[PDB]
Amino acid sequence: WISLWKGFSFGSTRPRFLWQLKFECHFFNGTERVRLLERCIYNQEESVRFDSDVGEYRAVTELGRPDAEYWNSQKDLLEQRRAAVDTYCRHNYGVGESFTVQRRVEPKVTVYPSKTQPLQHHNLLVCSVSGFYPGSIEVRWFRNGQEEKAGVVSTGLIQNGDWTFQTLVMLETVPRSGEVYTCQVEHPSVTSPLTVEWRA
Amino acid sequence: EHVIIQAEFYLNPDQSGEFMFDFDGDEIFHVDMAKKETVWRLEEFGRFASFEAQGALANIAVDKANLEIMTKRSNYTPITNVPPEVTVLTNSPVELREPNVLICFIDKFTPPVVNVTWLRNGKPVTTGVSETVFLPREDHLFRKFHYLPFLPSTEDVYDCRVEHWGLDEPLLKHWEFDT
Numbered sequence A: 001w002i003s004l005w006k007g008f009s010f011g012s013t014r015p016r017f018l019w020q021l022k023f024e025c026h027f028f029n030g031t032e033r034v035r036l037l038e039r040c041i042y043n044q045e046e047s048v049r050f051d052s053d054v055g056e057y058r059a060v061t062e063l064g065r066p067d068a069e070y071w072n073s074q075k076d077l078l079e080q081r082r083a084a085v086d087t088y089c090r091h092n093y094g095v096g097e098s099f100t101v102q103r104r105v106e107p108k109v110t111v112y113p114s115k116t117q118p119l120q121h122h123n124l125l126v127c128s129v130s131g132f133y134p135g136s137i138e139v140r141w142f143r144n145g146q147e148e149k150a151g152v153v154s155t156g157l158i159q160n161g162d163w164t165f166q167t168l169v170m171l172e173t174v175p176r177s178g179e180v181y182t183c184q185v186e187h188p189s190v191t192s193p194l195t196v197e198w199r200a
Numbered sequence B: 001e002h003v004i005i006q007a008e009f010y011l012n013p014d015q016s017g018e019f020m021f022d023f024d025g026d027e028i029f030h031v032d033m034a035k036k037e038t039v040w041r042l043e044e045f046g047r048f049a050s051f052e053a054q055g056a057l058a059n060i061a062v063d064k065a066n067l068e069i070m071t072k073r074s075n076y077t078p079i080t081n082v083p084p085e086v087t088v089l090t091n092s093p094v095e096l097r098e099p100n101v102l103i104c105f106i107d108k109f110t111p112p113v114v115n116v117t118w119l120r121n122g123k124p125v126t127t128g129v130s131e132t133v134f135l136p137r138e139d140h141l142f143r144k145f146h147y148l149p150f151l152p153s154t155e156d157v158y159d160c161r162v163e164h165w166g167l168d169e170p171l172l173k174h175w176e177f178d179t
C-alpha cells in the first residue's frame, strides 16, 4: 500500500487557517481506465491541481499560480506523477480489490406497520433494510402479488460509517384485513431477491 | 466505478492534523498522530494488507509547512466557519429490551474541530461510545460519526450535543422511543 509524496510550495477565539490535499483515483470499467487527480485546498477553496488527463499542474485560483509554475518546472516530479497512475492508483486497487471492491454483506429486512399521522389506523407500512454493502440496492413494494409503485415514499441510501448501509422504503396504504403485502429486496450480495411479508 | 481518496489536512493554530484513506465515502484507515501507528477502520482489513505509518507522518510535516506558506500568500485570510447539520438515527429497528446502537452524523462543517458529548436523560454518557475521524467531502467540508450502544426503554431519552465555532448555541438533537 503506497502513499504519494509531496514537495513544498513557493515562498515562506483566535482565527483559524486550514490546508488540505486530496489524491483521488478514479476507476472506470475496473482498471481499464484510471485517472489521478491531486488537489491543494487552502481553507475551502481549491487553488492548484494535477490531472492525469492533462499531465501538468494547473491553477484553480490566484493562490495556485505560483505553485503551478514552480511544480511544473520540476521535470522529475511531473514524470513521476504521470506514471503514478500505475505505480499508485492501480497498485492500491490490487491491494484492496479483495475486501472492498469485492465486498458483499447481506441485508436484513423487516416489515412493520406505522402511522404517518395520529390517524391511529396504521395506514403506513415500513420496510426496513439495514446492514448491507454495497449501496446499490432495489426495494420494491407488492400488494396481493401486484407491484405498487405509486404512494411509495422512501429514505435515501444512509451511510453508517462502519461499512454498512441502511434504508427505509415506506408504503402509504389502507390495510384491509386479509391482504398480504410483500417487500422485495434485490442486492448484489444475494442471487435471489429477498421477500418479507406482513399480514393485516 | 470506484474512487479511492488519500486525504490529509493540517489546521492552525490548533496544530491538529490528520491522515486517512477514504473508499467510496467509507474510511479505510487513519493514522493516529499521538501513538504514531496505523489504525484500521475494521480489524479484518489488517490481515490482508499493511501500511508504514512513517510515510504518513512525513506528509503531515509537509502539510504544516505548506499551510504556513499558503497563509502568508493569502494575506493571512482566515476561514469562514460553517455550522454542522446534525442527524441522530438508530442502527436497526427499535425493540424494547433489545440492544442497539445510536448514531450522531455530523456533516457539512469546517474547520474540522468539534466537540461532541452524548446526553442521555439529563446526564452525560461516556461509556460504550466510539467515533470516526473527520472524513473528506467533495465540497471540502467534513464528515464525522459518533456512536452510542444503548438499551431501549420507554422512559429513557437521548440527546447529541454538538459544539462548533460556527454555532451560536450548542445544537441539540433529540431521540426517544415513540409509540
Ligand SMILES: *[C@@H]1O[C@H](CO)[C@@H](O)[C@H](O)[C@H]1NC(C)=O
Residues within 6 Å of the ligand: B114, B115, B163, B164, B165
Ligand atoms: C471543544 O469544543 C468547544 C466548542 O467551541 C471549544 O470551546 C473548546 O475549546 C473545545 N476544546 C476543549 C473543551 O478542550
